[PDB]
RNA sequence: GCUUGACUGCGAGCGUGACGGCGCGAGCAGGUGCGAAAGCAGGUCAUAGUGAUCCGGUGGUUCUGAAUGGAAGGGCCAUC
RNA sequence: CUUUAAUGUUUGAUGUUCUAACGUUGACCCGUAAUCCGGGUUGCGGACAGUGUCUGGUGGGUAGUUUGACUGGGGCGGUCU
RNA sequence: AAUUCCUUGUCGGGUAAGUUCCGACCUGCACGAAUGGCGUAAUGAUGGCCAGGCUGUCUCCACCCGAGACUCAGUGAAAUUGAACUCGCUGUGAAGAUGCAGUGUACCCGCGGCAAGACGGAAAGACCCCGUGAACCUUUACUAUAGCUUGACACUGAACAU
RNA sequence: GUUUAUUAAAAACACAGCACUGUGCAAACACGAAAGUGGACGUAUACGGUGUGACGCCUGCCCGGUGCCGGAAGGUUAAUU
RNA sequence: AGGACCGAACCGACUAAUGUUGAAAAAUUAGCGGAUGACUUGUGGCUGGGGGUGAAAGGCCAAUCAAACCGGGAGAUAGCU
RNA sequence: UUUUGUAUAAUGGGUCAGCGACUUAUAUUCUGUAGCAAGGUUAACCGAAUAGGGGAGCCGAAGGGAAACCGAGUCUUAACU
RNA sequence: CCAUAGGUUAAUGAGGCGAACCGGGGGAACUGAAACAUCUAAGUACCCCGAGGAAAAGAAAUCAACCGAGAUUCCCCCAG
């Protein structure tokens, strides 16, 4: 499903407004993108489904550090 | 049709009759045009409404060349 | 209705004003009148202004 | 005890009259209803503040 | 449950010493210029609630 | 002819409305105008020329100001 | 200042030459007894396409509703202060 | 004219007599060319009209054969029903009377029949109206919205040319 | 030939044919939040949609309105800055 | 050769009568149409309710269809009787 | 039963028996009644516990004003006889 | 090419059921507004996930107001 593998962002629901404030249910989905991240330690490319906000934290945190937290959650690669 | 229109009645006429005791400021008659004219101790409003300027009995009388009807207050 | 309402502002600077109407086709000149000002408790000249 | 025979004086209508809102089950208008007009506590303007 | 006061009526009526309710006069919002000064002056002071509407006001204001 | 009473604060007592309300008002206070004065003037001979509340706008205001000083905002007055 | 021309300074607009993101419902290899999927090799495309947020337009495609009363029945006409 | 209101248009044909049919007229109230026009063999439980044959369709019904209806034995319902000692007439009367008034008539009770009435039975009227009822459907009704489309930003980086 | 099973079988629908239009194949389109599937294991001599309705003779005039298509100079105009 | 002809099975259901507390909650009798085909039929399978399916009648989707049935919101609401 | 009006040929009922419709909770106002009284009364809770404790609070004895404020006065107004 | 993916064993653990209560992911409409859009109904009904005997919450980047209080939960007031 539409879940970020780094930040865990998932679709959320809200209202479409209008000039008359009429509220209709809607969904907000993350800006998810499938990217192949280069992991130096394994000298390999690993593909992750990440949001655009997740991409920013990867540079700040390091490719190895983020993957270590994901392994704590536990998943396939 | 193009008719069938009217306005609410404004309740004109004599409110206090001859010999009635009235308080100062009480209107005696509401009218259109000077059917009655103000006499002694009687005021005239901007719409020719006659009001009492003193406490006393209402008296109607006819005097003058025009054979008009006048309202006066005898303040005892 | 084409006559438009105007305000007459006192010259004393109290900020009190009266309101009235005036004909725009004629009498272009501003309206000046001596009217009582409750703030100064005196009759002063009131000057035409714009309602806003 | 209404609606318990002729002799009781409140039978066959329960004191509710004849086929009005008050005679309906759960019937009756809300507080302040003036027949359709906006009620007096809405014809008049708000004033003041709470200190 | 506790009775809920009509909040719209609570912002326009205040209880007086003898149990009455005072309200401000209407007709003095935005067409007042064409009204004579005497008319505006009489509408400025506070007014008493009429006897016919006393029952309706008390129903809307059960806690005051 | 001269003028702005088409005045400000009020108002005894009445009228008419179920009510909201509408209408009339001597007189009082402060300041005016016209008269030599008595006096008259709170618009127009009178009765049509009009629209409640909410919301928002403008001016004024030592009323309020969520720790305190302000302020925002609100209130009041004028007014759209 | 106008008509402007050149000159210095800034965002963009297309076009192109790229590949490295991204795309490949091109080829080949492997997982593999597999027209799926994944990985690899290669070709092509390529900072587009495509998607997310925001935003303008369009939208009976699909919804929720409105569409007054009086009235010699109703509608039509007329009327509403 | 599957279209013509006036209208049974007018003329002709058909009939003893044709508001239909067929042929024309054009005055097309208010035909008309792919929301197709005009024709068209064949086809049609297709629509209209005519003729022959044929006949109880009818003039005008008669008889006969069966199955019911009728009687006996056995078994044995139903809809409906405020209660009935449940006549006619005229008048009255939620304004069309078995029940009121007046008056007339009528011994008590079955069976076979007919349906004039009991505003007969059936089903809280489908027409009409109303409710600030319901639902579907339409659209340049309102307010939205899926979808489609536009641009900015992100995914998305580096040279060159104008 | 088909149709209102249970009051309507028709002049209605379908029909072969005709024309317009969309669609270059990761096709348009449709079903699916998506993946995907149908279209089609087809490729414009194909497919979808629309109207007309064998055949015969033919199908005239209007692009103002409403749509659609093409253009983009100017006017106006969102998010953003 | 033929969505050819006549005509049984088979399938349809045009007319009339009966029946309408039916023999039968749609049939029977006498006629009627198709009857090698766009036929008919058996056994399985698939499409699900604002959806399906429909040679299109708002038809059909378990004797129910201008939005199936069952349960729930729910003692909806009902200025009406 | 519903109506201006029903023997009405307006609705209802074949009959009997059983069942079948103004309740409950909370708050508020008014009346009656009882207690205390310028005071009245506790709630949760404690508690061998329908007692007692708990006065946290609530209403009343002072109002006027939008409010600040003032106060048997107060507001309105420059000021009110 | 190492590797990695993958593959074969062996150990543990989980699968389902069950009334309500609880947390979380989704989430109506009828209705009320005497219509109806904001609003109400209602984060209710319902669906889904998970846990326990309770769950959840919980040890101040909290309140107060220049005095102070000192986690969370629950009850009565404050207060319609
Ligand atoms: Mg009685
Ligand atoms: Mg009644
Ligand atoms: Mg004059
Ligand atoms: Mg609704
Ligand atoms: Mg009407
Ligand atoms: Mg004709
Ligand atoms: Mg002839
Ligand atoms: Mg002919
Ligand atoms: Mg035509
Ligand atoms: Mg055409
Ligand atoms: Mg024929
Ligand atoms: Mg013959
Ligand atoms: Mg016989
Ligand atoms: Mg029986
Ligand atoms: Mg009888
Ligand atoms: Mg009779
Ligand atoms: Mg008999
Ligand atoms: Mg008979
Ligand atoms: Mg109506
Ligand atoms: Mg049928
Ligand atoms: Mg038929
Ligand atoms: Mg056709
Ligand atoms: Mg053109
Ligand atoms: Mg055009
Ligand atoms: Mg054949
Ligand atoms: Mg044949
Ligand atoms: Mg059939
Ligand atoms: Mg019959
Ligand atoms: Mg049966
Ligand atoms: Mg045959
Ligand atoms: Mg259908
Ligand atoms: Mg139809
Ligand atoms: Mg059916
Ligand atoms: Mg529906
Ligand atoms: Mg159900
Ligand atoms: Mg409910
Ligand atoms: Mg019910
Ligand atoms: Mg009867
Ligand atoms: Mg009956
Ligand atoms: Mg008592
Ligand atoms: Mg105790
Ligand atoms: Mg205390
Ligand atoms: Mg006083
Ligand atoms: Mg409503
Ligand atoms: Mg346990």
From Swiss-Prot, chain A:
One of its GO terms (cellular component) is cytosol. It holds the Pfam family Ribosomal_L28. Keywords: Ribonucleoprotein, Ribosomal protein, RNA-binding, rRNA-binding. GO terms for molecular function: rRNA binding; structural constituent of ribosome. It comes from the Bacteria. Belongs to the bacterial ribosomal protein bL28 family. This is Large ribosomal subunit protein bL28. The gene is rpmB.
From Swiss-Prot, chain B:
Disulfide bonds: none annotated. It comes from the Bacteria. GO terms for cellular component: cytoplasm; cytosolic large ribosomal subunit. GO terms for molecular function: ribosome binding; rRNA binding; structural constituent of ribosome; tRNA binding. Keywords: Ribonucleoprotein, Ribosomal protein, RNA-binding, rRNA-binding, tRNA-binding. The keyword Ribosomal protein applies. Gene3D superfamilies: 2.40.50.100. PANTHER family: LARGE RIBOSOMAL SUBUNIT PROTEIN BL27M, RIBOSOMAL PROTEIN L27. Belongs to the bacterial ribosomal protein bL27 family. Part of the 50S ribosomal subunit. Cross-links to the 23S rRNA. Cross-links to the A and P site tRNAs. This is Large ribosomal subunit protein bL27. It comes from Escherichia coli (strain K12). The gene is rpmA.
Swiss-Prot record, chain C:
The keyword rRNA processing does not apply. Keywords: Methylation, Ribonucleoprotein, Ribosomal protein, RNA-binding, tRNA-binding. Coiled coil: none annotated. GO terms for biological process: cytoplasmic translation; response to antibiotic; ribosomal large subunit assembly. The keyword Thylakoid does not apply. It comes from the Bacteria. Pfam families: Ribosomal_L33. SUPFAM superfamilies: Zn-binding ribosomal proteins. GO terms for cellular component: cytoplasm; cytosol; cytosolic large ribosomal subunit. InterPro entries: Ribosomal_bL33, Ribosomal_bL33_CS, Ribosomal_bL33_sf, Ribosomal_zn-bd. GO terms for molecular function: structural constituent of ribosome; tRNA binding. Part of the 50S ribosomal subunit. Cross-links to the P and E site tRNAs. Surface exposed on the 50S subunit. Belongs to the bacterial ribosomal protein bL33 family. This is Large ribosomal subunit protein bL33.
Curated annotation (Swiss-Prot), chain D:
Residues 1-37 are annotated as: Disordered. Residues 4-14 have a biased composition (Gly residues). It comes from the Bacteria. Part of the 50S ribosomal subunit. Contacts the 5S rRNA. This protein binds the 5S rRNA. It is required for the late stages of subunit assembly, and is essential for 5S rRNA assembly onto the ribosome. Belongs to the universal ribosomal protein uL15 family. This is Large ribosomal subunit protein uL15. The gene is rplO.
């Amino acid at each position: 499903s539409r879940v970020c593998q780094v930040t865990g962002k998932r679709p959320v629901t809200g209202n479409n407004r209008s000039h008359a404030l009429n509220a209709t249910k809607r969904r907000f989905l993350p800006n998810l993108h499938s990217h192949r991240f280069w992991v130096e330690s394994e000298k390999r490319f690993v593909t992750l489904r990440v949001s655009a906000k997740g991409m920013r934290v990867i540079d700040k945190k390091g490719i190895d550090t983020v993957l270590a937290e994901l392994r704590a959650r536990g998943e396939k690669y | 049709t193009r008719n069938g229109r009217d306005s609410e009645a404004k309740r004109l006429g004599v409110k206090r009759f001859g010999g009635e005791s009235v308080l100062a400021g009480s209107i005696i008659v509401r009218q259109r045009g000077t059917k009655f004219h103000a006499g002694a101790n009687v005021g005239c409003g901007r719409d020719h409404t006659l009001f009492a300027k003193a406490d006393g009995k209402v008296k109607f009388e006819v005097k003058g060349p025009k054979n008009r009807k006048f309202i006066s207050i005898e303040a005892e | 209705g084409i006559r438009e309402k105007i305000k007459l502002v006192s010259s004393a600077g109290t900020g009190h004003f009266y309101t009235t109407t005036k004909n725009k086709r004629t009498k272009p000149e501003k309206l000046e009148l001596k009217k009582f000002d409750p703030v100064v408790r005196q009759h002063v000249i009131y000057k035409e202004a714009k309602i806003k | 005890r209404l609606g318990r025979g002729i002799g009781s004086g409140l039978g066959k209508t329960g004191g509710r009259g004849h086929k009005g809102q008050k005679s309906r089950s759960g019937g009756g208008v809300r507080r302040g209803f003036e027949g359709g007009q906006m009620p007096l506590y809405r014809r008049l303007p708000k004033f003041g503040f709470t200190s | 449950p506790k009775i809920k006061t009509v909040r719209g009526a609570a912002k326009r009526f205040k209880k007086t010493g003898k149990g009455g309710f005072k309200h401000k006069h209407a007709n003095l919002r935005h067409i007042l210029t064409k009204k004579a000064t005497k008319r505006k002056r009489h509408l400025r002071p506070k007014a008493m609630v009429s006897k016919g509407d006393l029952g309706l006001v008390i129903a809307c204001l059960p806690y005051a």
